[PDB]
Design a protein that fits this description.
This is part of a larger assembly, with chains A (114 residues), B (518 residues), C (165 residues) and D (182 residues).
Chain A: E1 58-60, E2 63-65, H1 80-95
Antiparallel strand pairs in A: 1-2
Chain B: E1 6-16, E2 44-45, H1 47-61, H2 66-73, E3 86-88, E4 91-92, E5 102-109, E6 116-126, E7 132-141, H3 148-158, E8 175-185, H4 190-199, E9 202-204, H5 206-210, E10 220-229, E11 250-253, E12 256-261, H6 263-282, H7 291-294, H8 300-303, E13 310-314, E14 316-319, E15 326-328, E16 331-332, H9 339-346, H10 355-362, H11 369-372, E17 377-382, E18 396-401, E19 410-414, H12 416-422, H13 430-445, E20 462-472, E21 483-485, H14 495-509
Antiparallel strand pairs in B: 1-7, 1-8, 2-4, 3-7, 5-6, 8-9, 10-19, 10-20, 11-12, 12-16, 13-14, 15-19, 17-18, 20-21
Chain C: H1 9-32, H2 35-42, E1 45-47, E2 50-52, H3 55-65, H4 74-85, H5 88-91, H6 100-109, H7 113-118, H8 131-163
Helix pairs in contact in C: 1-8, 3-8, 4-6
Classes of the chains: A little secondary structure (114), B alpha+beta (518), C mainly alpha (165), D mainly alpha (182).
The complex binds magnesium ion (MG) (2 copies).
GO molecular function (chain D): nucleotide binding
Organism (chain D): Synechocystis sp. (strain ATCC 27184 / PCC 6803 / Kazusa)
Protein name (chain D): Cas10/Cmr2 second palm domain-containing protein
């Protein structure tokens, strides 16, 4: 198997309800009908996890070596941003939202004749 | 002339205990709000501005009694009184060595979207903490001795109970007096009139007057929150850096720079949660209101204050504005760096190169980067394009995360006298405002109020270890507040007291009137 | 003019700086008011609803120019421009401007250029002998900051008009 | 009073200048056409009271005067057949009284005082700088189309007898001196 595949972004024209585009609930007060609060989550690794610290990287003959990023208490510091982007893209997929990051992609790509 | 039994020259050093701002006419191309400068362009405290701060405090001391205040500060109306007996000169501000005027950025955050409101971006020049200026008072006594209210004033200055200039509730303006000196000239007599002309006066021991009075501090509730960052806490600097795009804000504090969370920022997060609680209880939506109307809701108008706004509300013309009874100080890091040591961080250009020496310097581990990066740690981030993976073209950025900077306890000062004046004296009416404040502090200790930049993006969550409540002269039914709390859920406050506050609070929830409406 | 040795020469110098500062501020307001001049001075322009460059790109430059307190800080501003000019995606943000990056490089590095754009007759504003050359060297960085500040403000509030059509 | 009345004697002479600018067509020797006009002050001073100092101190630049103040109260219908009709319309009190209503109009001010005083300050500058400040504002406050005088919605000044003149400062001055029991 090629190590990547794609989940289809179905077009969303004429979608309605909470899966559709809608005015955001906002931050001014807690809405009587909508849920708020704290979720506690456990994350356990299955294959090894890379958390490379680009601040401590070392360069020899233009090759870069990365250590693991560690926190002030010396344990591996898994950034919340890395978890957030994991969840965000996984959330966009199963919810089928808009894609958050599309670069311009406005040039015609090129190929070669056989 | 005006008969004078004795002229007292009362002088010493005033020090800025937090950054000052006395405003000029305003605007200066460098900042929106610009410091007052004298005719030589030197920064100064106008004697009008200082004289009014002193007269103001005496008026709060003498319970807004006019009769005695006019006998010191003079009057225009009464046929007997006229010119002021206290004279206050202009005083030039001497900023510390190498230090310079700082610019503080400000933003207003839309209460609905949680993002900066349109047009609500501003910046303020401030005199750094530890700047000095001369106390320049003269008093022309027509009676013998020295007025006790004028002695209480000088005791209040030495206690640092007077605030001067703008943004007094949002970090700025505290001053404290040092080196008080009193020179008496007995201008009523030949030996005294020549002393004024030649001999430079008669010394008085301040400690001898300071012994004949008890300093009556007004009602207040001091709140000290002891906390540490659970995720890196910072306020972002004013603009992007070289090796690091996002750098923490720092301020001069005498010889050293320290990381700072402005009181503006801590006030703003507290206000936001206070409003959300009130609007939640009432289910009052915030979305259709513009930002100046979003801010304006009950109890918070008294605690955090409201903008001046004249209204012909009932043919009668009234001002809606009132100052915040709640004031917040700037919170500085325990860690400190020499000013050039941080200038080495601001001007690093290679994250793996010359930045590494600079952070080893500033973190205090000049030979041990693996300890240096347990204090300030550079982080890299990418935006990952959703079709291709990899990274979106251009979307690479880095943060200097103060993962391990330790922070001093936050000081919140609640002016119980100012609320009690808003409620026309009725201490029953304090309990909803005190109840709200304790609910805000309950959330702060439960990680419900993150602080600073990037709160949704891996920063800003604080652990609160201890809240110390230390009020002075509190009314007897609020006297149970004087406590040190370590349970986040306030269970260290007496249940009878928490149950009393809950009752007055619930009775306000059942009818959320404008509580200062007499 | 006052003789150079004159005792009040220090006091006259306070008055001149005040008259110069207000002249520079007033002239900077007028020059920002016209879109041809903002384009002459910084290369910035409006094209339909679009701004060249984006207001964010002007804001980024402006934040650096805040550090230009003295001519010896011009290293700071020229350092920003070279790092910008070295990154291809960022340099091209300023394409479709009228030479904007060179015009900024010039305004910061050519000490005569700010005074030619302001084009103020300072003769009615000075009373000290050798006052003109001294005050020009002193107020240079402030004039650059004032003119750039004015131009970007005037740009944005005309951009709002083209936007709101 | 004796000082304040001496002003009213000088203000009447200015109001009475209509007796030369609006005239019965082809009359000879030229006779004033019947036109009724006001001039008013609002002192805000403790001593000085010289009409000439008063009016030149708000004529800040040789091309510019900040007052349109000899105001015609006669209805535009009656004047339409005199010479100087277009002059009388530029000076019609209804222009001032209208502009005052816009300033007074509103749950909040249509043009904020905060912004009226920004314009007020700039009017004391050169017209180029005065127009510059208006152009910073003119689209943020749609009411400002009514205060324009250029026919372009880009200046508070209109040309008059080679001078530049404005009603904006008369409207700010007189704003609270247009009250009526009716
Ligand atoms: Mg401003
Ligand atoms: Mg870089």
């Amino acid at each position: 198997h090629n190590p990547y595949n794609f989940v289809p972004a179905l077009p969303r024209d004429g979608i309605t309800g909470d899966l559709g585009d809608c005015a955001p609930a906002g931050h001014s007060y807690y809405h009587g009908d909508k849920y708020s609060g704290r979720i506690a989550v456990k994350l356990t690794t299955v294959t090894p996890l890379l958390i490379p610290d680009a601040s401590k990287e070392e360069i020899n003959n233009n090759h870069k070596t990365y250590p693991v990023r560690i926190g002030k208490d010396g344990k591996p510091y898994l950034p919340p941003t890395s978890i957030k982007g994991m969840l965000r893209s996984a959330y966009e997929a199963v919810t089928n939202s808009r894609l958050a990051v599309f670069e311009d992609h406005d040039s015609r790509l090129a190929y070669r004749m056989p | 002339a005006r008969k004078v039994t004795t002229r007292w020259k009362i002088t010493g050093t005033l020090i800025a205990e937090t950054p000052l701002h006395i405003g000029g006419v305003g605007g200066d191309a460098d900042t929106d709000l610009a410091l007052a400068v004298n005719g030589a362009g030197e920064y100064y405290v106008p004697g009008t501005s200082l004289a009014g701060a002193l007269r103001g405090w005496m008026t709060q001391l003498l319970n807004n009694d006019e009769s005695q205040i006019k006998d010191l500060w003079g009057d225009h109306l009464d046929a007997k009184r006229g010119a002021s007996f206290v004279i206050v000169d202009d005083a030039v501000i001497h900023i510390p060595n190498n230090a310079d005027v700082e610019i503080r950025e400000g933003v207003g955050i839309d209460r609905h979207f949680g993002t900066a409101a349109n047009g609500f971006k501003y910046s303020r020049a401030v005199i750094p903490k530890g700047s000095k200026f001369k106390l320049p008072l003269t008093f022309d006594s027509q009676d013998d001795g020295l007025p006790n209210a004028l002695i209480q004033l000088l005791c209040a200055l030495e206690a640092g109970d007077i605030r001067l200039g703008a943004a007094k509730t949002r970090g700025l303006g505290r001053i404290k007096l040092d080196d008080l000196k009193l020179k008496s000239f007995a201008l009523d007599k030949p030996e005294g009139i020549f002393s004024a002309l030649l001999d430079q006066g008669k010394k008085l021991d301040w400690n001898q007057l300071k012994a004949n009075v008890t300093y009556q501090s007004p009602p207040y509730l001091g709140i000290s929150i002891t906390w540490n960052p659970k995720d890196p806490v910072m306020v972002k600097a004013e603009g992007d850096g070289l090796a690091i795009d996002i750098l923490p804000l720092v301020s001069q504090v005498g010889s050293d720079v320290r990381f700072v969370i402005p009181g503006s920022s801590i006030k703003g997060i507290l206000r936001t949660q206070a409003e959300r609680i009130i609007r939640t209880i009432c289910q009052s939506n915030g979305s259709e209101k513009n930002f100046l109307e979003q801010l304006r809701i009950n109890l918070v108008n008294e605690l955090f204050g409201s903008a001046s706004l004249s209204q012909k509300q009932n043919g009668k013309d009234i001002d809606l504005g009132k100052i915040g009874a709640l004031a917040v100080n700037d919170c500085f890091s325990s860690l400190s760096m020499t000013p050039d040591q941080w200038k080495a961080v601001e001007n690093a250009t290679e994250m793996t190169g010359n930045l590494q020496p600079a952070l080893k310097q500033a973190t205090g581990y000049p030979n041990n980067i693996s300890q240096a990066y347990k204090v300030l740690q550079p982080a890299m981030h990418v935006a990952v394009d959703r079709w291709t993976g990899g990274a979106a073209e251009g979307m690479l950025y880095s943060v200097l995360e103060p993962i391990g900077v330790t922070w001093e306890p936050i000081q919140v000062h609640l002016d119980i006298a100012r609320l009690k004046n808003y409620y026309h004296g009725k201490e029953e009416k304090l309990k909803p405002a005190i109840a709200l404040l304790l609910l805000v502090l309950r959330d702060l200790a439960n990680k419900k109020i993150p602080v600073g930049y990037g709160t949704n993006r891996g920063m800003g969550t604080i652990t609160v270890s201890q809240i110390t409540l230390n009020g002075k002269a509190l009314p007897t039914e609020l006297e149970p507040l004087n406590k040190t709390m370590t349970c986040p859920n306030l269970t260290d406050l007496d249940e009878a007291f928490r149950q009393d506050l809950s009752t007055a609070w619930k009775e306000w929830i059942a009818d959320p009137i404008d509580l200062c409406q007499q | 003019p006052l003789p150079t040795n004159h005792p009040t020469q220090d006091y006259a110098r306070l008055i001149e700086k005040a008259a110069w500062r207000e002249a520079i501020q007033n002239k900077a307001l007028a020059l920002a008011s016209s879109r041809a001049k903002r384009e002459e001075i910084l290369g910035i322009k409006i094209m339909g609803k679009d701004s060249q460059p984006t207001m964010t790109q002007l804001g980024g430059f402006r934040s650096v120019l805040k550090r230009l307190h003295s001519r010896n800080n011009r290293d700071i501003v020229t350092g920003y421009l070279t790092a910008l000019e070295q990154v291809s995606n960022r340099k091209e943000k300023w394409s479709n401007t009228s030479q904007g990056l060179t015009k900024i490089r010039n305004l910061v590095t050519q000490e005569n250029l700010i005074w030619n754009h302001l084009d103020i007759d300072f003769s009615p504003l000075t009373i000290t002998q050798n006052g003109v050359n001294q005050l020009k060297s002193e107020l240079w960085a402030e004039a650059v900051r004032t003119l750039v500040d004015a131009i970007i403000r005037g740009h944005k509030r005309d951009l709002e008009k083209a936007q709101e059509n | 009073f004796s000082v304040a009345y001496t002003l009213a004697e000088r203000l009447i002479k200015s109001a009475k200048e209509v007796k030369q600018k609006v005239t019965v067509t082809n009359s000879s020797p030229i006779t004033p056409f019947p036109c009724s006009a006001i001039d008013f002050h609002i002192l805000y001073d403790s001593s000085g009271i010289d009409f000439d100092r008063i009016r030149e101190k708000l004529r800040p630049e040789d091309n510019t005067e900040l007052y349109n103040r000899p105001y015609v109260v006669t209805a535009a219908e009656n004047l339409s057949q005199a010479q100087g009709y277009e002059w009388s319309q530029a000076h019609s009190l209804q222009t001032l009284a209208d502009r005052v209503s816009y300033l007074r109009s509103e749950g909040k001010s249509a043009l904020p005082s905060s912004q009226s005083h920004a314009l007020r300050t700039a009017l004391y500058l050169e017209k180029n700088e005065a127009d510059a400040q208006y152009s910073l504002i003119s689209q943020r406050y749609k009411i400002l189309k009514n205060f324009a005088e250029d026919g372009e919605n880009k200046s508070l000044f209109h040309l008059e007898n080679g001078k530049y003149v404005t009603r904006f400062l008369d409207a700010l001055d007189a704003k609270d001196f247009f009250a009526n029991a009716n």
